[PDB]
Design an enzyme around this catalytic site. Structure first.
Site, PDB file in Angstrom:
ATOM      1  N   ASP B 290      21.495 -22.357   2.978  1.00  0.00           N
ATOM      2  CA  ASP B 290      20.712 -23.453   3.534  1.00  0.00           C
ATOM      3  C   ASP B 290      19.729 -24.101   2.590  1.00  0.00           C
ATOM      4  O   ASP B 290      19.499 -25.314   2.645  1.00  0.00           O
ATOM      5  CB  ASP B 290      19.967 -22.989   4.786  1.00  0.00           C
ATOM      6  CG  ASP B 290      20.885 -22.341   5.775  1.00  0.00           C
ATOM      7  OD1 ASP B 290      21.355 -21.224   5.482  1.00  0.00           O
ATOM      8  OD2 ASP B 290      21.170 -22.957   6.813  1.00  0.00           O
ATOM      9  N   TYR B 374      22.278 -24.731  13.729  1.00  0.00           N
ATOM     10  CA  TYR B 374      21.013 -24.003  13.908  1.00  0.00           C
ATOM     11  C   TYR B 374      19.740 -24.736  13.519  1.00  0.00           C
ATOM     12  O   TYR B 374      19.761 -25.752  12.802  1.00  0.00           O
ATOM     13  CB  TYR B 374      21.147 -22.782  12.995  1.00  0.00           C
ATOM     14  CG  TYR B 374      21.742 -21.599  13.710  1.00  0.00           C
ATOM     15  CD1 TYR B 374      22.674 -20.802  12.983  1.00  0.00           C
ATOM     16  CD2 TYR B 374      21.459 -21.236  15.015  1.00  0.00           C
ATOM     17  CE1 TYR B 374      23.282 -19.686  13.597  1.00  0.00           C
ATOM     18  CE2 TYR B 374      22.033 -20.150  15.623  1.00  0.00           C
ATOM     19  CZ  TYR B 374      22.952 -19.375  14.920  1.00  0.00           C
ATOM     20  OH  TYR B 374      23.547 -18.287  15.518  1.00  0.00           O
TER      21      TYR B 374
END
Ligand SMILES: [Cu+2]
Ligand SMILES: [Cu+2]
Lengths: 620, 620
Positions: B290, B374
């Site tokens: 990420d 997410y």
């Protein structure tokens, strides 16, 4: 009327009256412990027979007794004399603690030691502590207290800053005789004061903190009925209070739409040991069983509004009995309130264009207690998503000693010449499980790593394994943080929509357990503390991990004895005992008054619900 | 003014002008990463020199370049071409994500796969995910994104509920070719919707939640000066923001009396890896970096008051560069507020008659980000007592798959036919230590149990041992929750009054680390995640545990490379890299939308102060 309500002042008086009338409470009798017995196993049982258990001590050295009285029918149901040298001594009475300093003050050996240190006897405070069982055969059957000295220069002075090391006394509190005075050598008494209220130590007070106001313009979201019954955001429970354990939570349940489903039948800190790891003869016997020996509920503080409990608070003022059977209320001894807990759930979806955010909140039930130098807060939390969490907060003044010349492997320095013996604070949460009812079982879930090869060519696969604890002989488990070990309590006959047994997963902090040698008295007396999780078949008489009478018991009394029965725990009425604590090597910033440190555990739903139980929470 | 201030729009535009003028930013160029660099080491600060580093992608296919420019001097410091097959591809461009679904929609092999499942292409969303490095030789040197399909039944539908398993496509985002379409077999596509906003699914919304008003009558206690310099309750620091790392903290220092004492020079989450543990070829390549691949700071949400951030909030709106070098502001991207934190300290003393209670509070600095399904909140906390803590909050929607008929060892069921592959969310906090200055060292502290016998006759003694990590080769450490293992960062040349080197102790949650087989691609690419703690000698070019270019990059860079230098870390300018994460075994309770789960760490003073730093906190 609920059979779980808090005992009334009049019920205590009623037990007093019943006892004295039965001639079991003469001038030499002292109530060492008194608490209501909550409902035995039933279902449609409606016979309101309110009973209380009492431990009656005898100041004349006559055998004590364990009595059970029905406050409902006004009768003595049971009364049994105890052989304390076999089954242990009753909890220490506050009055017995008081007599230690008094006696020593007139003892020659003691005064001799104080004189050699140039310590004015009227300035010496004595911390009268539990004795445990060591190598003094003469103590068996007798009630001993061991005292350690601390110099208090003036009324408002903090004596803990001035430990008198190299000195310890043993006092028989019934015959009121100083059985021993041990003086291993003079150690200078730490001179600096530890008065955190003195502007010379605090310096000018900060004027930089702006006020944070927490209010609830519409009042709380929880409702209290029947004095101690809580209803909050699907949760349902009864807040009880016992002089020995403190706050106890009963019938913890979550209303899943239509049904009110049970999760935990009873939740409490059944014990809490504070063992010291200083090998010096002066303190090597020091082990506080705050719950078992001192009774933490007895020392519950009166919490102030805006100070101890901020926000919209709802208080419970529990009533306990004194040494003579007179009811005594701990005014504002329990705080009930709900607090914001940040974000509950959030997602900003690109494809749907929906940005969703929800806030979480926790119901808080708490109390604080003072055990001499230390103060402990016990907090139980209920979250919107179904999480149950316990958090113990430790503050107070650390127990001091002198800091040896040349340093020490078991003591840390806090100030010039001021030592702080290493120790642990280990709790035991007793959880009478009721996952959708009593038929429960426990599985130990470990993370399973897999090897790269056939079926796992890229070596990216990882799994999990669950081992059911079937009998008690295999229910004494240890932690393994490395493999992500947790424990699941499920109900074999209650399945969710995906046809899987509903459950709750216990997440431990995996702190170190009892460090003492396995052959030590304390390892024997607090065996519960040597392992992280224990599972036992339920039994009405198995209430504490250390036994009923912890004071001076020789060892092997609670959990290790219960487990030896090796009963079937696979899909039975079971109880989970979780050991968790703080291992303490006191630091310079813990002096003169220790800032809060915490430990805990929590349980999260694990296939208990059919989907997230918080889909109905509004935006707000 | 301060060289630590946040980059402004003007500086970004100026960097664009400098690159342009230098002929480095023509029409085919795209900024894949742009951020201001930290001032060079050494107090020898010859005026202000704001430099920025840029990764420039070429849409035509020419080699990309890494460039450092002095926006102050209007010069290009350096600019080098990148052989991406050796050193790694640049971070994925936002524009490249759009590409995948578009190209796939016109590919015959893809349409054929969709038709075989009776799915309308106009309804198939594609999650364009990073590729990593596997067995596809044709991918070396190319920018590939792999796509996974999800059916969205209507605009406002959550496609995550309808995963199309058995299918994956690989796409070259520069040449715009669908290099591969893999179909392993048709799977039923989960039918139930996951629309957590659908009244039919939520049921009527609760009307039981009353308001909790958190306000600050006189405003906050912290001050914000020079745009991002915060001063609060003795603490001093600069809140920076980088497009890759997100919120970054600089110059964390505590004012001890007359001295501003540094603790941490720089704190940031340097990497964040989310590896999947399903051995299915459809997802066995799935590993989100990420921070390194996607850049979390670029996807930071705009936080709404009362919803995301409750209380008195002071916002920061950091500026980042878009793909063309134009500045783009993230409005209300960072929240700064202080919050009540219960009891700070409490003691009711019998002997002195003094009852003392003080409340704690913490400074909160946070931001939330969205990486597809997410959403992660990054929270930094500064406490009154000197504790520094980080907390990562994981929420959003879980990544789904089909649940295989007959169960699975690497996937759990969330609904009928709906699966959720096992995975982890592992972070790396890079802590550029400055304990009272740069001369620091790290000791690994373990609890030491002692054998009963001579010198410890009662077997109650327990100690502790500290091992100084002298060279980087012995500074790659693992957790040991059993022995209460922690890590202390001290300044060997700065002692507290008790003549002990000041220090701070790091408390890890000791969660499992990277589970993947050590010979896997992910283990090598996320080597950092295989160990809990790494200590390195500071270097201005060692910023990420995974290196500068993570996208489709093999092992060979990052921590394992830095470590090999075996530099002296004993009383030097050192950096601590702590790996910590969550193992997510998705539960039914995580569906349709996951309730917040957390992980983190904290550092507490360890003989840093001369006594508790909070004695000056008033009661009021
Ligand atoms: Cu302690
Ligand atoms: Cu997860």
């Amino acid at each position: 009327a609920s059979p779980f309500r808090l005992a009334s002042a009049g019920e205590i008086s009623e037990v007093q009256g019943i006892l004295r009338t039965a001639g079991l409470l003469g001038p030499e009798k002292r109530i060492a412990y008194l608490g209501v017995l909550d409902p035995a196993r039933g279902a449609g049982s409606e016979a309101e027979d309110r009973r209380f258990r009492v431990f009656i001590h005898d100041v004349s050295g006559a055998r004590p007794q364990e009595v059970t009285v029905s406050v409902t029918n006004g009768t003595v149901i049971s009364a049994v004399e105890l052989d304390t040298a076999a089954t242990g001594e009753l909890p220490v009475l506050e009055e017995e603690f008081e007599v230690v300093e008094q006696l020593l003050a007139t003892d020659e050996r003691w005064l001799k030691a104080l004189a050699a240190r140039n310590l004015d006897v009227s300035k010496v405070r004595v911390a009268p502590l539990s004795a445990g069982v060591f190598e003094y055969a003469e103590e068996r059957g007798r009630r001993i207290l061991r005292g350690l000295a601390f110099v208090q220069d003036f009324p408002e002075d903090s004596a803990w800053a001035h430990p008198v090391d190299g000195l310890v006394a043993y006092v028989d509190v019934v015959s009121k005789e100083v059985t021993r005075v041990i003086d291993t050598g003079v150690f200078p008494v730490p001179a600096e004061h530890g008065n955190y209220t003195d502007p010379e130590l605090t310096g000018p007070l900060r004027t930089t903190q702006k006020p944070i106001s927490i209010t609830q313009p519409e009042g709380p979201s929880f409702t209290v009925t029947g004095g101690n019954h809580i209803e909050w955001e699907k949760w349902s429970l009864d807040v009880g209070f016992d002089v020995r354990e403190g706050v106890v939570l009963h019938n913890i349940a979550f209303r899943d739409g239509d049904r009110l489903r049970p999760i935990i039948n009873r939740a409490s800190i059944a014990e809490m040991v504070v063992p010291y790891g200083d090998p010096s003869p002066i303190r090597s016997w020091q082990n506080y069983f705050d719950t078992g020996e001192y009774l933490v509920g007895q020392y519950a503080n009166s919490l102030e509004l805006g100070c101890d409990c901020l926000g919209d608070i709802t208080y419970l003022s529990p009533v306990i009995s004194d040494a003579f059977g007179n009811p005594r209320e701990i005014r504002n001894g329990i705080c009930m309130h709900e607090e914001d807990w940040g974000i509950l759930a959030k997602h900003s979806d690109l494809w749907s264009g929906i940005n969703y955010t929800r806030r979480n909140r926790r119901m808080v039930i708490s109390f604080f207690t003072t055990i001499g130098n230390y103060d402990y807060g016990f907090y139980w939390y209920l979250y919107l998503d179904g999480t149950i969490e316990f958090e113990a907060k430790a503050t107070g003044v650390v127990f001091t000693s002198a800091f040896p010349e040349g340093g020490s492997d078991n003591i840390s320095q806090l100030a010039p010449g001021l030592g702080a013996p290493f120790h642990q604070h280990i709790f035991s949460a007793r959880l009478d499980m009721a996952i959708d009812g009593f038929t429960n079982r426990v599985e130990e879930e470990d993370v399973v790593r897999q090897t790269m090869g056939p079926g796992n060519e890229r070596g990216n696969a990882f799994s999990r394994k669950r081992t059911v604890l079937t009998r008690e002989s295999e229910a004494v488990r240890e932690a393994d943080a490395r493999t992500g070990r947790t424990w699941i309590i499920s109900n074999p006959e209650s399945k969710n929509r995906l046809n899987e047994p509903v459950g709750y997963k216990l997440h431990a902090h995996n702190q170190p357990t009892l460090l003492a040698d396995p052959g030590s008295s304390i390892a024997r007396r607090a065996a519960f503390a040597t392992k992280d999780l224990w599972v036992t078949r339920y039994a009405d008489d198995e209430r504490y991990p250390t036994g009923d009478f912890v004071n001076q018991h020789s060892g092997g009394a609670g959990l290790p004895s219960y487990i030896a029965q090796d009963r079937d725990i696979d899909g039975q009425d079971i109880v989970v005992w979780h050991t968790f604590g703080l291992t303490h090597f006191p630091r310079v910033e813990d002096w003169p008054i220790m800032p809060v440190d915490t430990v805990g555990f929590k349980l999260r739903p694990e296939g208990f619900f059919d989907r997230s139980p918080v889909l109905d929470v509004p935006a707000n």
